[PDB]
């Protein structure tokens, strides 16, 4: 059966596995920069369907994510984990350790939205996410990313950092990344803060100093939050020394 595209590199054979899950558009380079400075773990730097070598991978929603993640860490014989998302990444992640997994450590999320709270929030994203949907399905991605990247998630950033990102996000399948946005929209996706508080596994919160949106939302999580000076939504780009010190904390006690 099929399997997520992924970048294996091995470490220390008694360390667990660092499994790397990137954001929307993003592919398994991402936490590359970051996953390079834990040398002595082993590392999987995975693509998640309809991104990088996983493009042609189709899901319907979060449950077909997961058992293409429970399916890729049993081929590459990973029995001890933990799960790092970023992002959309990091709501896989969520999704897919509240599911279950055998072996996981714990879960590490940047910048993951743990659910909407209500019917009328999910009805507002649904909207304008079939919005970008159709933009993604039939413009030039090089347009729609240079507006993508001015929504006010991103407004930390300065035109400079969004000309390369425009640049490098460019360069994907539309068609993929909008069945990918679709089968795991927000607004889709279940209230996870109860599963979280439950303490099922452990579970640590990553987001830039600059995340205003989700340094309150990990206010209402039952999780330790690091805050990553001098960065914004993506903070392990902005500032990887900083997100590797606190992976490190968090890996090495
Ligand atoms: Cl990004």
């Excluded at 954001?23 to 082993?42: I, P």
Aim: glycine letters at 8%; proline letters at 4%.
């Amino acid at each position: 059966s099929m399997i997520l595209h992924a970048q294996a590199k091995h470490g220390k054979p008694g360390l667990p596995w660092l499994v790397f899950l990137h954001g929307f558009s993003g592919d398994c380079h991402e936490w590359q920069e970051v996953g390079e400075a834990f040398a002595d773990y082993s590392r999987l730097y995975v693509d998640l369907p309809g991104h990088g070598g996983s493009a042609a991978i189709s899901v319907d929603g979060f449950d077909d994510v997961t058992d293409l993640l429970r399916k890729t860490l049993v081929s590459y014989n990973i029995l001890d984990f933990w799960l790092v998302g970023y992002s959309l990444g990091g709501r896989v992640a969520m999704m897919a350790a509240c599911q279950g997994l055998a072996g996981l450590c714990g879960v590490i999320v940047e910048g993951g939205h743990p659910g909407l709270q209500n019917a009328e929030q999910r009805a507002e994203r649904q909207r304008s996410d079939r919005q970008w949907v159709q933009r993604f399905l039939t413009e030039p991605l090089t347009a729609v990313f240079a507006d993508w990247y001015q929504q006010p998630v991103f407004a930390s950033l300065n035109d400079d950092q969004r000309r390369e990102l425009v640049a490098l996000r460019s360069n994907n399948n539309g068609a993929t990344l909008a069945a990918m946005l679709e089968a795991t929209s927000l607004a889709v996706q279940p209230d996870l803060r109860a599963n979280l508080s439950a303490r099922t596994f452990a579970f640590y919160y990553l987001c830039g100093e600059r995340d205003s949106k989700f340094r309150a939302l990990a206010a209402e999580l039952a999780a330790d939050c690091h805050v990553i000076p001098r960065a914004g939504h993506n903070a392990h780009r902005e500032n990887p020394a900083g997100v590797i010190a606190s992976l490190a904390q968090i890996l090495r006690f």
